Amino acid sequence: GSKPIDVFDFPDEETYETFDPPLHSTAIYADEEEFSKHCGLSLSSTPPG
Amino acid sequence: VDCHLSDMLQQLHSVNASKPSERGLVRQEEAEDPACIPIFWVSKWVDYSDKYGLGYQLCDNSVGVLFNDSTRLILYNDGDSLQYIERDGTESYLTVSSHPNSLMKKITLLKYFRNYMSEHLLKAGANITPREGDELARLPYLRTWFRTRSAIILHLSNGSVQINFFQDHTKLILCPLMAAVTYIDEKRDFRTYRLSLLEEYGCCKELASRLRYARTMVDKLLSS
Amino acid sequence: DCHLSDMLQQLHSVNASKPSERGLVRQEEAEDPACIPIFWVSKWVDYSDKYGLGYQLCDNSVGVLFNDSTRLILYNDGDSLQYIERDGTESYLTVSSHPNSLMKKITLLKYFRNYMSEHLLKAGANITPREGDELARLPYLRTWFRTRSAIILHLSNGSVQINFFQDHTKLILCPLMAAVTYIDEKRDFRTYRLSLLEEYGCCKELASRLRYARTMVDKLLSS
């Protein structure tokens, strides 16, 4: 790696507030299986029959 | 639209005051005016208001969401064009391919809504064919909505108010610009009437009782 | 690396048999649930512009591969720590008792962990742990890189994991078992013996991911 580890301004509760990773794995909201399930248990318009 | 809801309230008060079902002769067919068929209505919807909000599809296959934070996101029927209406009404136009960073979440949630509706819900009014030039009409968004124990009430930004009854699947689409109402009966048959002609020719108790209920709901829309 | 070379040989053998070009593909005949891996990466955070790459393993331990090529791992007990220096040298400490020189990296680890626990979904959360698996040695992230289509994660036990961004599919390659676990776009988790995919075939989607895997293992060996 060529970029340094930048911990020269490190200590604390607001330092976690400035913690803003630009890229990460799949977020909790992006679970379509769970979304579709809640829709099935929630009120919706008429289904096929 | 406060001015459109006010006209519709007066229109409903008028027809209900004439007691259109309490008449010896009823000629409901003479109150029909096919020229007043609406362009847009809500064909599907999902109440995820516990977490995200209310998702819906319009009859042109466009999709929209009214999020709990009072913003709105509309995905046009091309599948790429997008319109975002902030809480202030501040409109903006973008594309799914643009992949906005501030809208990644809302876009993803809208796709989930779209996918559920397409794979699990029927399209209301699928037997209604589109007239020429309806593609040019400006696309409305859901201004406000609420549900009672018996119905969901959907107020569109073009002034239209739609009421879907849960148990028997009947629906009303009210258009204050034409002073007209479209009724979808239990058999899914579509019929469009002039409200002023219902006063003068009469109608069945099924439609009259729903127009009485509609007036009550329009008053509720105007309260808040 | 001996493990990467073995994996390359396995993938070369399978792909050369063109497993999706069979009259009748019988991929299910290659499934072997006894080869479920013990460890995989269940979340990750790429902060490589400032700090490095934090991750969670499926046993809920966490780790960071810092930009200076050292790694710090917190076990799922939430106190035990393992520090791996640039040359692989390993040392053991705890959150309550640690050299002061590691204080900043420990704090950084907690930020990664708190971020992951409150924002990110756990991949493979459905898979249940077997008995005795908690005795296994904890691997660390040896290296990683990002491409247009995927992130590639190389674990110290020889496993290579590839997560595809577009459709959320994932591969976990285990050279010790000559096996591959595939998590498809519905989050279905299945483990296959590579020798049996070569014999019985596999579908076009998995065959394509396995060609990609081979290109990526070739790249890991290049550098």
UniProtKB/Swiss-Prot annotation, chain A:
It is found in: Cytoplasm; Nucleus; Chromosome, Centromere, Kinetochore. Phosphorylated by PLK1 at Thr-26, creating a self-tethering site that specifically interacts with the polo-box domain of PLK1. Changing residue 25 to A: Insensitive to PLK1-induced degradation. It comes from the Eukaryota. The modification Phosphothreonine is found at residues 26, 46. Expressed at high levels in the testis, fetal liver, thymus, bone marrow and at lower levels in the lymph nodes, placenta, colon and spleen. Present in all cell lines examined, including B-cells, T-cells, epithelial cells and fibroblast cells. Expressed at high levels in glioblastoma cell lines. Belongs to the CENP-U/AME1 family. Component of the CENPA-NAC (nucleosome-associated) complex, a complex that plays a central role in assembly of kinetochore proteins, mitotic progression and chromosome segregation. The CENPA-NAC complex recruits the CENPA-CAD (nucleosome distal) complex and may be involved in incorporation of newly synthesized CENPA into centromeres. Plays an important role in the correct PLK1 localization to the mitotic kinetochores. A scaffold protein responsible for the initial recruitment and maintenance of the kinetochore PLK1 population until its degradation. Involved in transcriptional repression. Component of the CENPA-NAC complex, at least composed of CENPA, CENPC, CENPH, CENPM, CENPN, CENPT and CENPU. The CENPA-NAC complex interacts with the CENPA-CAD complex, composed of CENPI, CENPK, CENPL, CENPO, CENPP, CENPQ, CENPR and CENPS. Interacts with MLF1. Interacts with PLK1. This is Centromere protein U. The lineage of its organism: Eukaryota, Metazoa, Chordata, Craniata, Vertebrata. The chain holds residues 39 to 101 of 418 of the full protein.
From Swiss-Prot, chain C:
Ubiquitinated by the anaphase promoting complex/cyclosome (APC/C) in anaphase and following DNA damage, leading to its degradation by the proteasome. Ubiquitination is mediated via its interaction with FZR1/CDH1. Ubiquitination and subsequent degradation prevents entry into mitosis and is essential to maintain an efficient G2 DNA damage checkpoint. Transmembrane segments: none annotated. Placenta and colon. Residues 168-170 are annotated as: Important for interaction with phosphorylated proteins. Residues 123-137 are annotated as: Linker. The modification Phosphoserine is found at residues 5, 80. Disulfide bonds: none annotated. Belongs to the protein kinase superfamily. Ser/Thr protein kinase family. CDC5/Polo subfamily. It is linked to Defects in PLK1 are associated with some cancers, such as gastric, thyroid or B-cell lymphomas. Expression is cancer increased in tumor tissues with a poor prognosis, suggesting a role in malignant transformations and carcinogenesis. Interacts with CEP170. Interacts with EVI5. Interacts with FAM29A. Interacts with SLX4/BTBD12. Interacts with TTDN1. Interacts (via POLO-box domain) with the phosphorylated form of BUB1, CDC25C and CENPU. Interacts with KIF2A. Interacts with CYLD. Part of an astrin (SPAG5)-kinastrin (SKAP) complex containing KNSTRN, SPAG5, PLK1, DYNLL1 and SGO2. Interacts with BIRC6/bruce. Interacts with CDK1-phosphorylated FRY; this interaction occurs in mitotic cells, but not in interphase cells. FRY interaction facilitates AURKA-mediated PLK1 phosphorylation. The POLO box domains act as phosphopeptide-binding module that recognizes and binds serine-[phosphothreonine/phosphoserine]-(proline/X) motifs. PLK1 recognizes and binds docking proteins that are already phosphorylated on these motifs, and then phosphorylates them. PLK1 can also create its own docking sites by mediating phosphorylation of serine-[phosphothreonine/phosphoserine]-(proline/X) motifs subsequently recognized by the POLO box domains. This is Serine/threonine-protein kinase PLK1. It comes from Homo sapiens (Human).
